[PDB]
Design a protein around this motif. Structure first.
Motif, PDB file in Angstrom:
ATOM      1  N   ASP A 168      23.808  65.292-102.155  1.00  0.00           N
ATOM      2  CA  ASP A 168      23.137  64.795-100.956  1.00  0.00           C
ATOM      3  C   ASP A 168      21.748  65.405-100.718  1.00  0.00           C
ATOM      4  O   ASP A 168      21.074  65.098 -99.729  1.00  0.00           O
ATOM      5  CB  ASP A 168      24.026  64.927 -99.719  1.00  0.00           C
ATOM      6  CG  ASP A 168      24.269  66.347 -99.316  1.00  0.00           C
ATOM      7  OD1 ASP A 168      23.678  67.280 -99.904  1.00  0.00           O
ATOM      8  OD2 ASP A 168      25.083  66.522 -98.390  1.00  0.00           O
ATOM      9  N   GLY A 169      21.324  66.251-101.652  1.00  0.00           N
ATOM     10  CA  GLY A 169      19.981  66.855-101.640  1.00  0.00           C
ATOM     11  C   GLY A 169      19.663  67.819-100.508  1.00  0.00           C
ATOM     12  O   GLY A 169      18.481  68.103-100.261  1.00  0.00           O
ATOM     13  N   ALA A 170      20.691  68.313 -99.803  1.00  0.00           N
ATOM     14  CA  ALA A 170      20.478  69.274 -98.729  1.00  0.00           C
ATOM     15  C   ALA A 170      19.835  70.563 -99.248  1.00  0.00           C
ATOM     16  O   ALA A 170      20.015  70.935-100.404  1.00  0.00           O
ATOM     17  CB  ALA A 170      21.778  69.619 -97.996  1.00  0.00           C
ATOM     18  N   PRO A 171      19.052  71.245 -98.406  1.00  0.00           N
ATOM     19  CA  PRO A 171      18.525  72.520 -98.884  1.00  0.00           C
ATOM     20  C   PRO A 171      19.618  73.564 -99.056  1.00  0.00           C
ATOM     21  O   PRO A 171      20.743  73.418 -98.562  1.00  0.00           O
ATOM     22  CB  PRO A 171      17.622  72.984 -97.761  1.00  0.00           C
ATOM     23  CG  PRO A 171      18.214  72.423 -96.578  1.00  0.00           C
ATOM     24  CD  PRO A 171      18.769  71.048 -96.970  1.00  0.00           C
ATOM     25  N   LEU A 172      19.250  74.602 -99.785  1.00  0.00           N
ATOM     26  CA  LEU A 172      20.108  75.746-100.067  1.00  0.00           C
ATOM     27  C   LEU A 172      20.042  76.700 -98.875  1.00  0.00           C
ATOM     28  O   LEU A 172      19.537  77.799 -98.927  1.00  0.00           O
ATOM     29  CB  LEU A 172      19.726  76.410-101.358  1.00  0.00           C
ATOM     30  CG  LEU A 172      20.141  75.587-102.566  1.00  0.00           C
ATOM     31  CD1 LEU A 172      19.466  76.214-103.789  1.00  0.00           C
ATOM     32  CD2 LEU A 172      21.637  75.526-102.744  1.00  0.00           C
TER      33      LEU A 172
END
Ligand SMILES: [Ca+2]
Ligand SMILES: [Ca+2]
Lengths: 253, 253
Positions: A168-172
């Motif tokens: 889902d490409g969420a940040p780390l």
């Protein structure tokens, strides 16, 4: 981090556990431990208004798929340099977990790293992991994560090194790191040869990162008397240490 | 483990903090964090009647030398395979720490160790540590521990390896391991060059040992924003892993 999370007030939040946050072998579907940690850290930071430094969470009982998880935050202290909180998770009034979390962020200090990342191949030079444990078809958390093998042919005894990336490409961020830290049960299955359950989750965050690959660098160093323990370091793709974590596990047997 | 510890009942205990359990720089004397952890684990095991697997403790406030520390134990569950408890420490009703502890010991499982001890010289081949931090003359915990340098000329970045031995000849039980795990602040002082305070203590015990030397094998891998973290592995003199621990620290600055 969690769109479905609803805040009733400073102190009280609720979220319904859907398949996206669930894990388990066929016949079982329950809230992912790492997601529990993520949620606890999320509500603490949101209530206190500063970032998490570390948290520990003890699992008391299981949260079945479909439950409404109530989270209650107690602030034990909030000063200029540090805040501390406790977060209780309950379902229908039943305690499922409790935690202690430290929050803060001080100006005027440098970032420093003494640890060096293991020399694993970059993500595009690593094959997909085709050996994840079987999951109930309604426990779909793992489906949302891209996993590659980073350990090479001769990974040392007790170690498991995986490249992980949220589809889902969420940040780390803290939530993502808490979730990735709870991949230690997979490391246990590898170390023992058996595809345990966590007793707790601990996370120590040094820094966050933009979206991308995370090196999930795990060791299961020892076990005895029906229990085991594990430690994990979470790195970005460039060798920066984001967080560490650990847990103890009850062995299936 | 603690002769001065008094039990009021299952659930309630008290101990007066004397110089033997105190640390601090001159002008300061407070209960050693590791001793706090030791005490929490002791009362939990004594109340539940089984051995500790792991515990986490959050420090809320300081316990000055001479205080009476009240410990209260709450058992969240006690079944055939596992028990969980919480332990609160208070002084004069003021919360100084809270903790979560898992207890258990299952028959029918083997002991297993994947981790290998670092190849340090044996204790009698290591010099005394002459660089411990200065302590208040009334904070005498450290005086009771024999410390030798195990790291050699080229100890890696961020690491500190010490041989530790209780002068009182106590076994390397849960209490001793909890205390030795809280030597990470010394590792921080070495990593930074500055002779921080712990936010918490975490301990995971695999096994105990008879009296003797303990290799206290520490790393401070990273720091940022006024905080740092550390991890420790406690070994016996023969390469057996007894426990691991970790904590986060607030930097002095
Ligand atoms: Ca608030
Ligand atoms: Ca009892």
């Amino acid at each position: 981090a969690f769109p479905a999370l609803v805040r009733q007030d400073d102190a009280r939040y609720a979220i319904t556990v859907g398949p996206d946050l669930a894990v388990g072998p066929p016949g079982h579907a329950y809230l992912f431990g790492g997601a529990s940690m993520a949620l606890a850290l999320d509500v603490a930071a949101e209530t206190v208004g500063r970032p998490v430094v570390q948290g520990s969470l003890q699992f008391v009982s299981f949260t079945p798929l479909g439950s409404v998880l109530d989270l209650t935050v107690e602030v034990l202290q909030s000063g200029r340099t540090l805040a501390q909180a406790r977060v209780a998770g309950t379902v229908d009034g039943r305690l499922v977990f409790h935690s202690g979390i430290s929050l803060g962020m001080r100006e005027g200090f440098s970032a420093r790293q003494w640890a060096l990342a293991p020399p694993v191949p970059q993500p595009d030079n690593c094959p997909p992991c085709t050996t994840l444990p079987a999951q109930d078809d309604n426990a779909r958390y793992l489906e949302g994560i891209e996993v590659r093998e980073a350990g090479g042919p001769e990974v040392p005894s007790g170690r498991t090194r995986l490249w992980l990336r949220r589809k889902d490409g969420a940040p780390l961020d803290a939530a993502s790191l808490a979730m990735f830290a709870d991949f230690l049960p997979i490391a246990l299955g590898r170390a023992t040869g058996c595809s345990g359950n966590s007793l707790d989750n601990s996370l120590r965050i040094t820094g966050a990162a933009a979206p991308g690959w995370c090196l999930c660098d795990m060791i299961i160093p020892s076990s005895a008397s029906g229990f085991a323990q594990g430690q994990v370091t979470l790195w970005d793709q460039s060798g920066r240490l984001l967080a560490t974590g650990a847990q103890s596990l009850l062995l299936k047997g």
